[PDB]
Amino acid sequence: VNSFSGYLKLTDNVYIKNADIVEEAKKVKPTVVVNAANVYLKHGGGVAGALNKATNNAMQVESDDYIATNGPLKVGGSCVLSGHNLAKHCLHVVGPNVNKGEDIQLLKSAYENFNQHEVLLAPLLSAGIFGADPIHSLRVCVDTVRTNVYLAVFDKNLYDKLVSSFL
């Protein structure tokens, strides 16, 4: 049993809810929250900007030190950093950004990072301002992740379309 509440069950391991991931993280304090990161860990907008704002910019300060030491992530890659006030850990995962012309086949590689963690609170990778089709992102998630993933979808309209269209 875990603390996640109000989710619709899609599969054995994937759950979904219409929720603000920031508000969900603040309530649950999950072991892992996933950030929709870019390779520079520049948390300007979308899910990343919202998570970073909720940490009072401490996520960005920590991220800048990580990049100064290690250099940029790979598209499809990830790193584990602090979850600050939101979670124990933040798994920063880089899905391909269609608005930069990145290979959508890298979305499966991105989701494979989730398998290193038993339970996660996450957004749909490459959705929103990353430009991919969220229906596709949910399909890749279900077909790639084996660990228990609780998906937060901010937009109610999109949530209802993801559920209604789910095979």
Ligand SMILES: NC(=O)c1cccc2[nH]ccc12
């Ligand atoms: N760590 C895993 O890959 C995993 C997690 C939960 C259920 C699973 N079934 C087969 C693999 C697997």
